[PDB]
Amino acid sequence: MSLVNRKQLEKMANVRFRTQEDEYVAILDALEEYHNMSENTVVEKYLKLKDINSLTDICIDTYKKSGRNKALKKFKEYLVTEVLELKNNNLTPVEKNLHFVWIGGQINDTAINYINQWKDVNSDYNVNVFYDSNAFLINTLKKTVVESAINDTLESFRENLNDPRFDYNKFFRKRMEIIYDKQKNFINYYKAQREENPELIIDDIVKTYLSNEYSKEIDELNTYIEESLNKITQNSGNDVRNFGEFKNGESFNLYEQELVERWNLAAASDILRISALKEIGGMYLDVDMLPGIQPDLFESIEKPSSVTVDFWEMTKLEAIMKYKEYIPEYTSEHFDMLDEEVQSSFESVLASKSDKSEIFSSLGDMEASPLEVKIAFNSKGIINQGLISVKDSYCSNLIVKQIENRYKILNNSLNPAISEDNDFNTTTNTFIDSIMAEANADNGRFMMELGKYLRVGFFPDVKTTINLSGPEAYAAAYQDLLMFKEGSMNIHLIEADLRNFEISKTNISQSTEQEMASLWSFDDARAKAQFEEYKRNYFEGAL
Ligand SMILES: O=c1ccn([C@@H]2O[C@H](COP(=O)(O)OP(=O)(O)O)[C@@H](O)[C@H]2O)c(=O)[nH]1
Ligand SMILES: OC[C@H]1O[C@H](O)[C@H](O)[C@@H](O)[C@@H]1O
Ligand SMILES: [Mn+2]
């Protein structure tokens, strides 16, 4: 399992009558050094392999027709394998912290109920539910602005809505234009207020705005802030405004951009979660994730052949919540579709258990490499709804830097476009023209995903966040690690590469009810059902 020594590499890369060139010798020296590093940190050894890798590339480029290159390229594969060896063999304890994030408003009971299942089965774990005490009204601001735009849009189309099958995309298109205008109005107000009185907090500005523009009662908004603050305080709340390292770092401006300007709480949470992991260590979880089910629990019950795996995984939790009642209002939509015999097998199994510890597994003493961040997987690949990292892991730093470099590219084209104070369509075109002029061979595909940034949260199937602060930033960091580099923009890693960094599937139950409804995005199917909902809501409005 050891990777090659100096002599073994000289045999490999041997070419009769060719002297060892300086750049060849350099690799050889560096390799022997690496084998003298028993007492060094894993990170120190990774950095050595990184330099060995860099010296190998130099040698290859310096002598492109060399009989050594075939073996040198082989040697590079060995370096990667060694990183995985290093990663898999030098494990340190994961700090016993569970980190949840809920920002922008009051947390609901169902989110708390999911959180308590984890608490209930991981008593040795300190729980953080990150919130922003300056920013409990962002969810209200977005809701009010979007509902206002919904109404203005219907009043624009009117009877044209009847006929024929009017293209519902026209609705969301016109509504985006109105949303962009209102949002710009607020952003302009926020910036004017901050520059007039830097002591003002987001919520002060938001409630004044809501009161001025939407005739909201600030007394009521005040009471909601009060209630939200109290509730999260009682539920392991941890204020972002006290997270000093995060506040003073280069990501905080990105966080606030998503929070205050774009109203994208999932993107804001993407930025927060990884800084929390870097700075504190532990395990990050989305509030719609539940503890792993005990593997032995349902073994005696065979999945019917007619039913898919993901369907079966949903019904397991639905079975649990039906008979054990751990979480109020939990759906049994799928469990109920089953044959009565299979339902009986579930209730007989669950009945033979008296404890929640017999139902959900505990996380226990986990360990992972100082090099890595482990990430959840689903049918579509990596997903950052579950993350595991020791404090200050090398990858956590790689991910933070990916996100920041991704936002730097975004904002370089976006800010000038927005500062021309034009409408949605003009702004969009200007921004895309700039994105296009700035794209090259190795970021092209990333750039194609940015063009859509301005509609995030407001138009169906706009998922740009994924490419900016979400899963693609992690894939890119992993490529950084295994490619011995920084700033990868073209992802070429395959599933098997990324599988190296996976969280064991048994540590998380992903197929939950709340996971089936995205809070920051919505698909075409959902867009259609919203649009018709809005049509009928409005018609019933004579009240
Ligand atoms: O109003 C909100 C909505 C979302 N989130 C955060 O965004 C995460 C991702 O939400 P969701 O699971 O809906 O995203 P998805 O898995 O559908 O991409 C949540 O767990 C929260 O951390 C938040 O803090 N406030
Ligand atoms: O990156 C956008 C989103 O991607 C994934 O769907 C994760 O579930 C979510 O937590 C994240 O916010
Ligand atoms: Mn989710």
Curated annotation (Swiss-Prot):
- What result is annotated for mutating K463E? Impaired ability to recognize RhoA substrate
Where is the region Four-helical bundle?
2-91
> Which positions are annotated as binding UDP-alpha-D-glucose?
101-103, 139, 269-273, 286-288, 518-520
Q: Which cofactor does it need?
A: Mn(2+); Mg(2+)
Q: Which residues bind Mn(2+)?
A: D288, E515
Subcellular location(s) per record: Host cytoplasm, Host cytosol; Host cell membrane
Q: Where is the GT44 domain?
A: 96-468
Instruction: Indicate which residues the UniProt annotation says bind Mg(2+).
Output: D286, D288, E515
Protein name stated in the entry? Glucosyltransferase TcdB
Q: What species is this protein from? A: Clostridioides difficile
Report which part of the complete sequence is shown: 2 to 543 of 2366
